[PDB]
Amino acid sequence: AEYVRALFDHTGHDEQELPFKKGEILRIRDKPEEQLWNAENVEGKRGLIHVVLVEKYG
Amino acid sequence: AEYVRALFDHTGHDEQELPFKKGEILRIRDKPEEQLWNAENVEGKRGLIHVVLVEKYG
Ligand SMILES: [Cu+2]
Ligand SMILES: [Cu+2]
Ligand SMILES: [Cu+2]
Ligand SMILES: [Cu+2]
């Protein structure tokens, strides 16, 4: 809901954002392992996390 | 739902994934401009897109 707890260790890294043009059509990838959230950790660092690697905490 | 249409041009680039440890607690950032989807374009390129920059097409 508001908070999650990590089920595994995870090593930081980058992911790329698609470039696209106005009016371009895109298909959404809906497999669970491809879903991400924006998160913030105890030290204020912000970044993406994979939903499948965490669980609802609060 | 399944497909989106881009409302603006968007230049490709990277975003970082948080590193975290098993059991660590994280807060989810829920502002609209921080939400992303996984998408695929006409040429098979895969990448992240910002929800606020597109609209439901199909
Ligand atoms: Cu990833
Ligand atoms: Cu961007
Ligand atoms: Cu971005
Ligand atoms: Cu990762």
Author numbering:
A (entry chain A), B (entry chain A): 1 to 58
Authors' account:
In this study, we incorporated a Cu2+-binding site into a natural protein domain, the 58 amino acid c-Crk-SH3, to create a miniaturized superoxide dismutase model, termed SO1. The miniprotein was found to be a strand-swapped dimer with an unusual coupled binuclear Type 2-like copper center in each protomer. SO1-Cu was found to be SOD-active with an activity only 1 order of magnitude lower than that of natural SOD enzymes and 1 to 2 orders of magnitude higher than that of other low-complexity SOD protein models of similar size. SOD proteins disproportionate superoxide into molecular oxygen and hydrogen peroxide and are part of the enzymatic machinery that protects the cell from oxidative stress.
The ‘different from design’ nature of SO1 required us to elucidate the structure of the engineered SH3 domain-derived protein. Using X-ray protein crystallography, we determined the three-dimensional structure of SO1 with bound Cu2+ by molecular replacement at 2.0 Å resolution (experimental details described in the SI and Table S1). The structure is well ordered and comprises all 58 SO1 residues. Surprisingly, the structure of SO1 does not show the anticipated compact SH3-like fold of the designed model. Instead, SO1 forms a homodimer in which strand β2 of the canonical SH3 fold and the adjacent loop regions are swapped with a symmetry-related molecule. In detail, part of the loop between strands β1 and β2 (RT Loop residues; hinge 1) starting at residues 15, strand β2 itself (residues 23–30) and the loop between β2 and β3 (n-Src Loop residues; hinge 2) up to residue 35 are involved in the strand swapping. Dimerization creates a new antiparallel β-sheet formed by residues 13 to 17 (strand β1b) and a short 310-helix before β3. Most interestingly, the dimeric structure shows two identical metal binding sites, each with two copper ions CuA and CuB. CuA is coordinated by NE2 of H10 and H13. CuB is located 3.6 Å apart from CuA and is coordinated by NE2 of H50 and the carboxyl group of E15. Additionally, CuA and CuB are coordinated by the E17′ carboxyl group, which is part of the symmetry-related protein chain forming the dimer.
